[PDB]
Amino acid sequence: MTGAVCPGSFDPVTLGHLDVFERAAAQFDEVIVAVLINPAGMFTVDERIEMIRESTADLPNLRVESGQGLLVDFVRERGLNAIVKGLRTGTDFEYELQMAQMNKHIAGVDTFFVATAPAYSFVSSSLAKEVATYGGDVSALLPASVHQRLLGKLR
Amino acid sequence: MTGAVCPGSFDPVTLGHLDVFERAAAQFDEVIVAVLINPAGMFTVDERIEMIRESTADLPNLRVESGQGLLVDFVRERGLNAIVKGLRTGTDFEYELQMAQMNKHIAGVDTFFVATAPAYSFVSSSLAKEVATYGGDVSALLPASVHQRLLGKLR
Amino acid sequence: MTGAVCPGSFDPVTLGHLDVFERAAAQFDEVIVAVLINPNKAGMFTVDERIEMIRESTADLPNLRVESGQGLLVDFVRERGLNAIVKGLRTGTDFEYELQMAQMNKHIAGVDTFFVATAPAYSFVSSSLAKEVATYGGDVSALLPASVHQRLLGKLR
Amino acid sequence: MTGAVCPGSFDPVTLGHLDVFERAAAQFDEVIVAVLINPNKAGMFTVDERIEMIRESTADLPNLRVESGQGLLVDFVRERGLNAIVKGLRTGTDFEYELQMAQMNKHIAGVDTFFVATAPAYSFVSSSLAKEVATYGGDVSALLPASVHQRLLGKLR
Amino acid sequence: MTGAVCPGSFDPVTLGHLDVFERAAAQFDEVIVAVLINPNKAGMFTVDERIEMIRESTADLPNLRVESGQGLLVDFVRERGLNAIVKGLRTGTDFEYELQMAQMNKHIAGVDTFFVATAPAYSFVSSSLAKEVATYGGDVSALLPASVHQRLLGKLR
Amino acid sequence: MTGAVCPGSFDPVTLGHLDVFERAAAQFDEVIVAVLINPNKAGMFTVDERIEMIRESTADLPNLRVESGQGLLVDFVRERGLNAIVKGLRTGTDFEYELQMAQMNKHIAGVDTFFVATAPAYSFVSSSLAKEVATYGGDVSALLPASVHQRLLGKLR
Numbered sequence: 001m002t003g004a005v006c007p008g009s010f011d012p013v014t015l016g017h018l019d020v021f022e023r024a025a026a027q028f029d030e031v032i033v034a035v036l037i038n039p040a041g042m043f044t045v046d047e048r049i050e051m052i053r054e055s056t057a058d059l060p061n062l063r064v065e066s067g068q069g070l071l072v073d074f075v076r077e078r079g080l081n082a083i084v085k086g087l088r089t090g091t092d093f094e095y096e097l098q099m100a101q102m103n104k105h106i107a108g109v110d111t112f113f114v115a116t117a118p119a120y121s122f123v124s125s126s127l128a129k130e131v132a133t134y135g136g137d138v139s140a141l142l143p144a145s146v147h148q149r150l151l152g153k154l155r
Numbered sequence: 156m157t158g159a160v161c162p163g164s165f166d167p168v169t170l171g172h173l174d175v176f177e178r179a180a181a182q183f184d185e186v187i188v189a190v191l192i193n194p195a196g197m198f199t200v201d202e203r204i205e206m207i208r209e210s211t212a213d214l215p216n217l218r219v220e221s222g223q224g225l226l227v228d229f230v231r232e233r234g235l236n237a238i239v240k241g242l243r244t245g246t247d248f249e250y251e252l253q254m255a256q257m258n259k260h261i262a263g264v265d266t267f268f269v270a271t272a273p274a275y276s277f278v279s280s281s282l283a284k285e286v287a288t289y290g291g292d293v294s295a296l297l298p299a300s301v302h303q304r305l306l307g308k309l310r
Numbered sequence: 311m312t313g314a315v316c317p318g319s320f321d322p323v324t325l326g327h328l329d330v331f332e333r334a335a336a337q338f339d340e341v342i343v344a345v346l347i348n349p350n351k352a353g354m355f356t357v358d359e360r361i362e363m364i365r366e367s368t369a370d371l372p373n374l375r376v377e378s379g380q381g382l383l384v385d386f387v388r389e390r391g392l393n394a395i396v397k398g399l400r401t402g403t404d405f406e407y408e409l410q411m412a413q414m415n416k417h418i419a420g421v422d423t424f425f426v427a428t429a430p431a432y433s434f435v436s437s438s439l440a441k442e443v444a445t446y447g448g449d450v451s452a453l454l455p456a457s458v459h460q461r462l463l464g465k466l467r
Numbered sequence: 468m469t470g471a472v473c474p475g476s477f478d479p480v481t482l483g484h485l486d487v488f489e490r491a492a493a494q495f496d497e498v499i500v501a502v503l504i505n506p507n508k509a510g511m512f513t514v515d516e517r518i519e520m521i522r523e524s525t526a527d528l529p530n531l532r533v534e535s536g537q538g539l540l541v542d543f544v545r546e547r548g549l550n551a552i553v554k555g556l557r558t559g560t561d562f563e564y565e566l567q568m569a570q571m572n573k574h575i576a577g578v579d580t581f582f583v584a585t586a587p588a589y590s591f592v593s594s595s596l597a598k599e600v601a602t603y604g605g606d607v608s609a610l611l612p613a614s615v616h617q618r619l620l621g622k623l624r
Numbered sequence: 625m626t627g628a629v630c631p632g633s634f635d636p637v638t639l640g641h642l643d644v645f646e647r648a649a650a651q652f653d654e655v656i657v658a659v660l661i662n663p664n665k666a667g668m669f670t671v672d673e674r675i676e677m678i679r680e681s682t683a684d685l686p687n688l689r690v691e692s693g694q695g696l697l698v699d700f701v702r703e704r705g706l707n708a709i710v711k712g713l714r715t716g717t718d719f720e721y722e723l724q725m726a727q728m729n730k731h732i733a734g735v736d737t738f739f740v741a742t743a744p745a746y747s748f749v750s751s752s753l754a755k756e757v758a759t760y761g762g763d764v765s766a767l768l769p770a771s772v773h774q775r776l777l778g779k780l781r
Numbered sequence: 782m783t784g785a786v787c788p789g790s791f792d793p794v795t796l797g798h799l800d801v802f803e804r805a806a807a808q809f810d811e812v813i814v815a816v817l818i819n820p821n822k823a824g825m826f827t828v829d830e831r832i833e834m835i836r837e838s839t840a841d842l843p844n845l846r847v848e849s850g851q852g853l854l855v856d857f858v859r860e861r862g863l864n865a866i867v868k869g870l871r872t873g874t875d876f877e878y879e880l881q882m883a884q885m886n887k888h889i890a891g892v893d894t895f896f897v898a899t900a901p902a903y904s905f906v907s908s909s910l911a912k913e914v915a916t917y918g919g920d921v922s923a924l925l926p927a928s929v930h931q932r933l934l935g936k937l938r
């Protein structure tokens with residue numbers, strides 16, 4: 001009964017996030033995607049959850065839930081003690097290392113990092129929204145469903 | 156039936172390695188420590204395997220084996236496709252990211268990185284051997300068994 | 311035939327920027343300095359002030375011109391028939407961030423980015439830090455062209 | 468008479484900060500901890516509360532004293548007859564941004580900066596992260612001086 | 625007439641290198657690929673084999689030519705009437721060591737260096753890692769030009 | 782009373798090292814430059830040559846002395862009644878590596894390490910790169926003290 005939580009704001013989820021989800025789902029019996037409401041973004045929590053569920057239909061051991069407060073409480077209240085997160089740069093690692101060691105200290109929750117797929121090294125939710133806002137084509141970087149939903153928000 | 160391989164030269168295994176072993180063993184049903192013979196070190200492969208087995212007696216789902224050649228062949232010939240490795244710095248991440256993406260490309264094997272425990276951020280097999288060689292006390296950095304075995308090699 | 315765009319907010323231009331301009335102008339037939347304005351946040355200097363400070367300190371570069379713009383940099387570049395951006399970089403940290411944007415710009419528009427290492431003497435000057443130091447009275451005259459220094463002190467007073 | 472200034476916001480002081488203070492006080496004849504007041508961003512503790520928390524945790528350091536400061540740090544340093552800053556560093560990116568500021572401070576005023584590596588146990592503690600964790604009920608008692616923790620629980624109630 | 629030199633050992637050339645060559649040839653009137661011979665470390669392919677592999681993979685680049693070089697790179701560059709180097713970068717630590725060399729080359733000879741970010745697909749390929757993987761039977765065909773791969777299988781038999 | 786050790790192989794000393802020496806000598810009552818010799822690998826300069834090159838370029842620093850040693854740096858430090866090492870750092874990459882050794886040195890012997898940011902003008906000089914450039918005939922006279930340059934060219938010829 002292994003399991004991990006994949007956290008983030010996912011505003012919106014990108015193909016980089018989805019690649020991490022599929023990789024976590026392939027190595028752990030249970031995966032929970034934690035959509036963290038940070039109470040100002042583009043999509044509502046429900047819409048963000050919707051887009052992830054649509055894009056993770058092929059992953060039977062994955063579910064999607066919203067959460068508030070400490071991530072470690074979200075993890076431990078579901079019987080787990082591992083977090084899985086994607087990393088692009090050494091700079092990412094240093095910032096995330098601080099939070100990973102804090103989370104282990106306060107609650108015994110482990111963090112496992114996975115290297116980004118090379119093709120998505122440059123995609124982030126914020127850069128994809130910025131480029132799309134000014135008319136650039138980001139369709140190769142986002143799940144097909146998400147892309148249409150993003151156009152709607154702009155138009 | 157989840158599982159991961161923890162690779163390295165482990166010449167000798169340190170408390171930093173052992174911390175990664177225990178963390179991998181807590182999140183995967185099966186863990187194999189792969190002692191990679193790089194065919195010049197201090198300990199023989201058999202001695203390195205011995206010291207790890209002695210220090211991992213409390214971990215029932217972990218075993219220790221030697222290997223040669225491509226790590227991904229070692230992993231896949233045992234039915235697994237995940238590697239777990241410890242990281243200390245962003246610099247570590249960048250070097251290891253290259254190998255992780257290569258390994259995923261050539262064989263579909265995933266790599267999960269874990270942040271070092273803060274207390275062991277500065278310990279490496281090479282620095283521990285260097286300091287011990289010149290008379291410094293490294294007993295707080297190595298498993299009790301390993302420490303005695305290292306003194307023997309020097310004296 | 312060859313050409314490159316050197317973008318930034320240049321609020322204000324520094325000696326580190328001018329070094330990049332000179333090195334680009336030496337290696338490309340034409341260089342356009344692109345003063346990118348955020349229509350939603352005013353900086354310290356207006357667009358015309360930024361352009362005049364750059365023009366005054368690049369008068370000896372005959373193949374360089376200065377133009378403002380907004381929106382996607384790649385559109386500014388391609389509308390001028392060009393395909394290359396030249397940017398200065400100070401650290402490995404600079405490189406990871408700028409690498410994200412350079413790969414995105416290549417992905418969406420085919421525009422290449424060439425990075426150049428800062429001159430050592432300017433490794434530590436940035437528009438933001440020079441403004442912050444000047445605000446509290448520190449002497450930054452050796453980090454900014456003559457075209458900028460006293461205009462900066464005037465803005466602060 | 469050697470000496471150095473240890474600057475920061477210390478809102479609140481952490482055991483990481485205290486480790487730096489102790490190491491500085493062991494190597495310089497005099498150390499001044501400079502509690503940097505920011506007229507804009509007012510955090511969780513008042514300046515006087517921050518000073519009293521540092522004084523409580525540094526009671527065994529007779530050559531260290533604590534004062535509030537405002538404006539340009541190199542003026543604070545040089546107005547006290549000193550010309551060195553001591554700061555703790557956790558990571559390589561810590562070094563990058565701090566390196567720019569140190570080179571700037573050396574250029575504008577001749578003040579030098581000495582960096583010390585964090586004790587391993589505190590590499591992950593910061594004032595901001597400790598406050599955030601504590602706000603949602605996490606136990607950060609092992610990361611802060613004994614007295615800070617009680618004062619921090621009171622501010623949250 | 626603008627131009628740049630693309631240096632390396634290219635033992636063997638990878639698709640990452642070729643991407644850099646193509647981007648340099650698109651932006652400079654002339655590009656010279658400099659295959660750096662090292663009298664000490666002789667790798668897997670002879671200099672002439674390396675040159676022929678690069679020429680095969682760059683057949684569609686008419687303004688790029690390939691030559692061997694020895695000794696100080698800035699002499700090679702300046703003996704050909706050029707004063708720019710173009711190199712690909714993968715990571716922030718790539719930038720660090722390369723930044724030192726670029727500043728040194730600018731200081732000692734006035735030669736500038738322009739860095740281009742790797743195409744994302746090749747961020748993990750290097751000559752050394754491709755050789756090592758291939759030596760133990762791994763399939764690196766998608767990371768090398770078609771012709772290199774055949775030649776590489778022959779050297780391993 | 783206060784004191785610090787500045788260690789290195791200094792083969793040979795550079796202007797970047799001398800800058801660190803001067804900054805340490807300004808902040809500590811005494812400074813010892815520790816020339817650490819590897820008895821198993823000769824460098825370019827003998828131990829006596831390294832010491833004389835340092836002494837000749839530090840003659841204006843009355844509180845600095847130069848001594849060689851081998852083995853554990855912390856033993857050199859503590860045998861002189863001191864507890865502090867001062868080292869220059871150029872990058873975040875420098876910092877991660879040196880942080881490992883500094884934390885180990887603190888762990889095994891209680892010795893503190895203070896790092897100082899390189900002067901910008903010397904960010905790119907290292908003993909190894911200056912030797913490599915000089916070997917192939919590049920001009921490094923502005924990166925080394927007078928005490929070194931011609932002795933270096935003599936070694937190479």
Ligand SMILES: O=C(O)c1cnn(-c2ccccc2)c1C(F)(F)F
Pocket residue numbers: 008014015016017020086087088115116117120121123124125126
């Ligand atoms: O923040 C984002 O916006 C965002 C969007 N895609 N990816 C992501 C990209 C590559 C690999 C894994 C994730 C991110 C993240 F990693 F930075 F987290």
Ligand SMILES: O=C(O)c1cnn(-c2ccccc2)c1C(F)(F)F
Pocket residue numbers: 163169170171172175241242243270271272275276278279280281
């Ligand atoms: O190489 C070594 O020698 C060595 C020895 N301990 N640890 C290690 C240290 C901290 C956390 C995890 C591992 C290493 C390693 F990570 F660098 F791999």
Ligand SMILES: O=C(O)c1cnn(-c2ccccc2)c1C(F)(F)F
Pocket residue numbers: 324325326327330398399400427428429432433434435436437438
């Ligand atoms: O951001 C700024 O305001 C700024 C101002 N000077 N320089 C700069 C410094 C050195 C070399 C090239 C440019 C920057 C930059 F590095 F960030 F690009």
Ligand SMILES: O=C(O)c1cnn(-c2ccccc2)c1C(F)(F)F
Pocket residue numbers: 475481482483484486487555556557584585586589590591592593594595
């Ligand atoms: O900013 C903070 O809030 C903070 C709080 N503890 N430490 C710190 C941690 C370890 C060693 C030295 C200091 C910091 C700092 F280094 F980031 F400065």
Ligand SMILES: O=C(O)c1cnn(-c2ccccc2)c1C(F)(F)F
Pocket residue numbers: 632638639640641643644712713714741742743746747748749750751752
């Ligand atoms: O050294 C090598 O062997 C090698 C082989 N491919 N690439 C490379 C990879 C991606 C983009 C550009 C070049 C390198 C280099 F960048 F590390 F230079």
Ligand SMILES: O=C(O)c1cnn(-c2ccccc2)c1C(F)(F)F
Pocket residue numbers: 795796797798801869870871898899900903904905906907908909
């Ligand atoms: O390794 C060397 O040989 C060397 C030679 N000069 N400098 C140096 C450069 C700038 C500031 C301080 C020192 C080094 C060092 F950075 F690596 F320490």
